[PDB]
Structure 1
Amino acid sequence: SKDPTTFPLGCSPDITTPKKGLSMELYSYDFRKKGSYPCWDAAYLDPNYPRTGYKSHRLLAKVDGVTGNINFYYHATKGCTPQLGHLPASYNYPKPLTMTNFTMLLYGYFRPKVTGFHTFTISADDLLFVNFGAGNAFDCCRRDSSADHFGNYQAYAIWGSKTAKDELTVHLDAGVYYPIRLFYNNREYDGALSFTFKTESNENTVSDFSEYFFSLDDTEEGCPGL
């Protein structure tokens, strides 16, 4: 149920109009004390960090309606220094934040337009961990109760690996709502996130998620498929 799979389970909500976009939570991420070498904290790679550790830091912002092109590259100018900047407009959060050092959680549902094999390509500085599918990300219209219980990642990218890029090929059904969780961190300096996909049905890369990302209310019974 929770394991990654090429045939992720999806959801069938009883809702005539879903809400556009994913939800986002932003969290602080500190450097180690001055005189530390390296200056940055390796906590971001603690195995618990994407599940619980990120919540030991300050919740900075919680917003809805994240969609469009969510890709970014923040070029820092100084090492081992908090520097302010902005997320792209697509994130619905125009306040400044420490773009050199922060954590971001996105969640909601991906609804495909076509049926078939989708190949998602991701890259990140410093990390992007992706869950995708009911159970693997969270349970259908039962997100609040299953949010902390995601399974092993469907895809991940870590700066400093051999390549810092990953693919995920999954077969999806058009119009089905698939639970998705993105977890991002910048430890220091530059920060970057790339999230795009292709399908077998044409050669174009999709980078604008405007009619693909949705939010659904939880219900007592949930909204499983099949």
Structure 2
Amino acid sequence: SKDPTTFPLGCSPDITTPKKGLSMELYSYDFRKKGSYPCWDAAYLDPNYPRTGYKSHRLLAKVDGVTGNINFYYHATKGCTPQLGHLPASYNYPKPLTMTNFTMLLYGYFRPKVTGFHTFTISADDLLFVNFGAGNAFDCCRRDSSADHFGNYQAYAIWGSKTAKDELTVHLDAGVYYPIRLFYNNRDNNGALSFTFKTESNENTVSDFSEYFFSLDDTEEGCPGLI
């Protein structure tokens, strides 16, 4: 199914070794013309923006190997102004960009170290939408064929809501590879992203996904979860 669940389906890759990290795509996201009220564009909140809307914007980059700690907080000096900044080294993107106003997509697989309930906690300024699980995010080693067909969000955080924070609790199996999609936007001013998790297994919070995030090439037959 494509719907969100407490028991997402995962994937079992064959020989070809998973590559470390997620793939990232960076897109432009403009302010409105000077004098507009507000200065920022609300286009990022169109329900189709994370499916088809972002594609109409300028592609800035596509990179592989995104892993480690992917959290960031970018302090702008003021609102309504394009300002330059850099993503954390973990994003494997060494060029400056308009950190005040941009859209970013991350996708790949999450591999647990434990079998049991995982709670992922997210926050964002302005927006982080998470899909998680086969179908919900995308199909097992059939991502290109299924990437636009993601289902309802497992978790989402929008700056301006009560909390700007959400959680996803899911039962996962260790060593299985779960499709994951993160969709981020900054419309104006400061920008933030937090993505961490805990499990029933202990009281450690994971912020560094060096051993958790992976990429698998698509295959003829796909790589459906065998366990």
In the alignment, the residues of structure 1 paired with residue 169 and residue 15 of structure 2 have an alpha-carbon distance, to the nearest angstrom, of 28
2:17 is the alignment partner of 1:25 = no
Q: Deviations over 1:72-111 (max 9, x none)?
A: 0001002100000000000000100000000000000000
Give the Cα–Cα distance (whole angstroms) in 1 for the partners of residues 145 and 162 of structure 2. Answer: 36
Counterpart Cα distance in 2 of 1:106 and 1:148: 13
CA distance in 2, matches of 1:34, 1:191: 21
Three-state SS of the structure 1 residue aligned to 2:122 is strand
Mapped to 1, the partners of 2:61 and 2:120 lie a distance apart of 27
How far apart are the structure 2 equivalents of 1:15 and 1:193?
Answer: 34
Count of aligned pairs between the two proteins:
226
Distance in 2 between the 1:84 and 1:56 partners?
Answer: 22
Unaligned runs of 5+ in 2: none
- Partners of 2:130 and 2:83 lie apart in 1 by 26
Q: Deviations over 1:31-84 (max 9, x none)?
A: 011110000000000000000100110000000000000000001002100000
Alpha-carbon distance between aligned partners in 2 of 1:15 and 1:125, rounded to the nearest angstrom? 39
Q: Distance in 2 between matches of 1:83 and 1:28?
A: 13
TM-score normalised according to structure 1 size: 0.99
Q: What displacement does 1:121 show? A: 0.2
SS at match of 1:148: coil
Tell me how far 1:15 sits from its aligned partner: 2.4
* Residue 128 of structure 1, CA deviation: 0.2
Give the percent of matched residue pairs that are identical in Structure 1 and Structure 2.
Answer: 99
SS, match of residue 144 in structure 1:
helix
CA RMSD in angstroms, aligned pairs only: 0.6
1:17-56 equivalent positions in 2, closer than 5 A: 17-56=17-56
The DSSP-based 3-state class of the residue aligned with 1:43 is: helix
Distance 2:135 2:98 in 1: 33
Q: Deviations over 1:185-204 (max 9, x none)?
A: 00000000000000011011
Deviation readout 1:12-32 (Å, 9 max, x if unpaired): 111252110000000000001
State the secondary structure of the residue aligned to 1:121. Answer: strand
Normalising to structure 2: TM-score of the pair?
A: 0.99
Aligned structure 1 segments of 4 or more residues deviating by more than 6 angstroms: none
Secondary structure of 1:197 counterpart: strand
Q: 3-state SS of the aligned residue for 1:145?
A: helix
Q: Secondary structure at the match of 2:148?
A: helix
Give the match's secondary structure for 1:90.
Answer: helix
Matches within 5 A, 1:1-226: 1-226=1-226
